Amino acid sequence: LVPRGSHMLPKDFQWGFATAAYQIEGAIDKDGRGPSIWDTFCAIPGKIADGTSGVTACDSYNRTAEDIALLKSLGAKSYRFSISWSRIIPKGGRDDPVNQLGIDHYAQFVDDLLEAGITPFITLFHWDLPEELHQRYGGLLNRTEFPLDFENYARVMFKALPKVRNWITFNEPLCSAIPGYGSGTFAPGRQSTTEPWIVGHNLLVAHGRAVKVYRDEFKDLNDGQIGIVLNGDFTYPWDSSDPLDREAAERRLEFFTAWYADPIYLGDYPASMRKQLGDRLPEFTPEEKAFVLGSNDFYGMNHYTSNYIRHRTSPATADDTVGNVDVLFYNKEGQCIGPETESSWLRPCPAGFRDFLVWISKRYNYPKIYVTENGTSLKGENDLPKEKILEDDFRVNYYNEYIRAMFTAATLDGVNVKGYFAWSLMDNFEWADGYVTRFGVTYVDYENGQQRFPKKSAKSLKPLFDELIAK
Numbered sequence: 001l002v003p004r005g006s007h008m009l010p011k012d013f014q015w016g017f018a019t020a021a022y023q024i025e026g027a028i029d030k031d032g033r034g035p036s037i038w039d040t041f042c043a044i045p046g047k048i049a050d051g052t053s054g055v056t057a058c059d060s061y062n063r064t065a066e067d068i069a070l071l072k073s074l075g076a077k078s079y080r081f082s083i084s085w086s087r088i089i090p091k092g093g094r095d096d097p098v099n100q101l102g103i104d105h106y107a108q109f110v111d112d113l114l115e116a117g118i119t120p121f122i123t124l125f126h127w128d129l130p131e132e133l134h135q136r137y138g139g140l141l142n143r144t145e146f147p148l149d150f151e152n153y154a155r156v157m158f159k160a161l162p163k164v165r166n167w168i169t170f171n172e173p174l175c176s177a178i179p180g181y182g183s184g185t186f187a188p189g190r191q192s193t194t195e196p197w198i199v200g201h202n203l204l205v206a207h208g209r210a211v212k213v214y215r216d217e218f219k220d221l222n223d224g225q226i227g228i229v230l231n232g233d234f235t236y237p238w239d240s241s242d243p244l245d246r247e248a249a250e251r252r253l254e255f256f257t258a259w260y261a262d263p264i265y266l267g268d269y270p271a272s273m274r275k276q277l278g279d280r281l282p283e284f285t286p287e288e289k290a291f292v293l294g295s296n297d298f299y300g301m302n303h304y305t306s307n308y309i310r311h312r313t314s315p316a317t318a319d320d321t322v323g324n325v326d327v328l329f330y331n332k333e334g335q336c337i338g339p340e341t342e343s344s345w346l347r348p349c350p351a352g353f354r355d356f357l358v359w360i361s362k363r364y365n366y367p368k369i370y371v372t373e374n375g376t377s378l379k380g381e382n383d384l385p386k387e388k389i390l391e392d393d394f395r396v397n398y399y400n401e402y403i404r405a406m407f408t409a410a411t412l413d414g415v416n417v418k419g420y421f422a423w424s425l426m427d428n429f430e431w432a433d434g435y436v437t438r439f440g441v442t443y444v445d446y447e448n449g450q451q452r453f454p455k456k457s458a459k460s461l462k463p464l465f466d467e468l469i470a471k
Contacts, residue, residue: 009410009469014119014418015461016076017425017441018373020126020171021084022054024428027061031101034090036128037139038431041187050434057429059450064109068116070442070452071425075462078119080372080421082126082171085153088160092130094152103160110163121372121421122161123168123229124154124210127176127187134188140176140199143282147206154210158218167226168300168372169210173203173260174231178321185432193318194280201282204263208291215297228264229300229372232257234352234359238310239332248311248325253359255323265364267293272323276316298418299360302373305345306337306352342377342437350401357409357417366416374402375423375439382436389443392455399457400464407468422461426452 022038029035042053060067071079085092087102113120129139137145154169170176179186181195207228214226233256235249254262254270262270267289274281284292308328316324329337329347338347353374360369376398381389399422409415427440435446441458445451 006411007470008467009407009465010418011470013420013465013469014078014121014370015420015465015469016078016080016118016121016422017071017074018080018121018421018423019060019082019425019428020123021082021087022057022126022128022429023424023431024058024060024426025084026054026056026059028055030061031087031105032090032099033084033102034086034092035131036084036086037131037134037187038128040131041189044189047189048432048434050436052429052434054429056446056450058426058444061105063450064112066452067425068112068118070454071118072116074441074454074458075465076118078121078166078419078421079113079425080121080123080168082123082128082168083157084128085125086128086130086132088156089153090130091132091136092149092153093133093136094149096132098156103156107160110161114163119166120164121166121168121370121419122157122164123171123372124157125150125169126171127180129187139188140181140202141195143198143202143205146202147209150206151209151213155213155217158214162218162221165222165224167214167224169207169226169228170203171229171372172231172302173200173207173228174256176203179432182319182321196321197277197280198282200259204260204292205288207264208288208293208295211295211297212291219297225297225368227296227298227300227370228260229302230257230260231302231304231373232356233304234306234349234356235309236306236331236337236352238308238326238328242311244311245309248323249309251323252307252309252325252327255321257360258363261299261360261364263289263292264294264296265367276320276324296367298368298370299364300370300372301356301360302423303353303356303371304373304375305347306349306355308337340379342379342381343433346376348376348398348401350398350405353402354405354409354413357406357415358413361413361415366414369415369417370419370421371406371417372419372421373423374399374420377430377437377439381438386443386445386453389438390453390455392441392457395441395455395457396460399461403461403464403468 177196184191237245310326426442427438430437
């Protein structure tokens with residue numbers, strides 16, 4: 001039932017894998033790296049489910065040749081990775097000493113990548129805020145100091161890495177804001193009914209400042225591009241015959257994603273958010289709005305799952321962050337979104353992936369889109385013998401259906417998606433979950449010196465994209 005003469009995806013379509021600095025690098029105090037808020041957070045008892053940290057992780061800091069060889073063997077055309085801020089500026093401040101070793105490390109890495117024929121896609125901030133900034137002025141909570149400090153940090157990296165064309169400011173600012181300052185499950189583990197909304201505002205302004213500097217001084221040097229990465233799981237009404245559930249499903253998307261995307265594309269927060277949050281949701285100064293409005297060269301999209309959404313009869317409470325809705329995996333009729341994984345929040349729903357691609361496109365005038373993270377955990381995978389971990393059949397199917405759902409969205413709906421990055425390149429430190437939860441296409445033997453064994457899914461992507469991408 002496949003058309004015989006379709007053009008398929010554009011030839012310059014990028015695809016590869018994605019990692020985060022703290023989740024894989026290790027070497028937390030090597031070559032002058034300063035502490036991040038996640039370094040100190042892991043020191044607090046009971047904050048990490050398996051009592052681990054990122055002290056060693058995958059030891060990717062010392063195995064750059066290995067990871068590149070791995071990437072090249074999987075046929076990856078592009079590679080998304082993040083840069084540890086406290087490796088560059090150990091204290092993080094714009095008047096703090098710059099660590100040349102940290103700069104040279106990533107500089108050397110980009111060169112090694114480029115020689116292997118792999119295009120770097122770099123994330124500036126993947127949650128590892130330098131601990132010092134947090135202590136000095138409250139870190140992400142500071143509306144004045146942090147956007148200035150991040151602006152400088154971005155500029156240092158733009159200047160230090162002239163060969164890089166693809167830049168990302170923040171990865172999932174929502175995850176820095178609500179788990180870090182609302183529920184306290186992520187660093188710096190604070191719990192507040194106001195601070196997440198303050199942080200999210202500061203992250204947007206800091207983003208806009210970096211984008212401004214990049215566009216003015218560095219972008220035209222090598223025809224580059226820059227954008228923020230926003231996560232977001234799609235939604236469906238718990239009871240479609242109930243209009244309140246339909247409106248609730250839409251509202252949830254606004255609280256999840258439009259929270260950041262509406263100021264970036266339209267100029268202000270969604271009305272639904274202002275209605276519920278009121279004075280708790282900051283207002284853009286004329287200067288801040290100028291920074292934020294139109295500060296996306298491309299739309300960076302992280303996507304994983306989908307949910308059924310049920311409206312709530314009782315009023316929104318102060319600690320509510322989702323938009324006064326129930327996030328479910330079953331609808332009124334008893335249908336299930338998908339099967340279980342090792343993550344309680346993740347259930348495979350490839351249709352939601354396409355729906356989110358379209359939802360973004362229709363709302364923001366079909367912008368350039370990069371899927372900077374797709375992936376899944378696998379239920380009880382950590383309890384499996386090495387022989388059976390490599391049989392990533394569940395994850396193989398996940399990628400096979402999601403990527404094909406993306407294909408339909410691109411070739412049918414005409415979604416301007418330009419790239420797809422699989423999360424993750426290898427099993428790593430999944431934050432509060434620790435190493436128990438595995439998202440990698442490559443198995444990492446933590447007990448036997450973090451040796452890398454490509455699972456079945458790692459090998460399935462190259463043939464799949466060869467089929468879906470034009471010649």
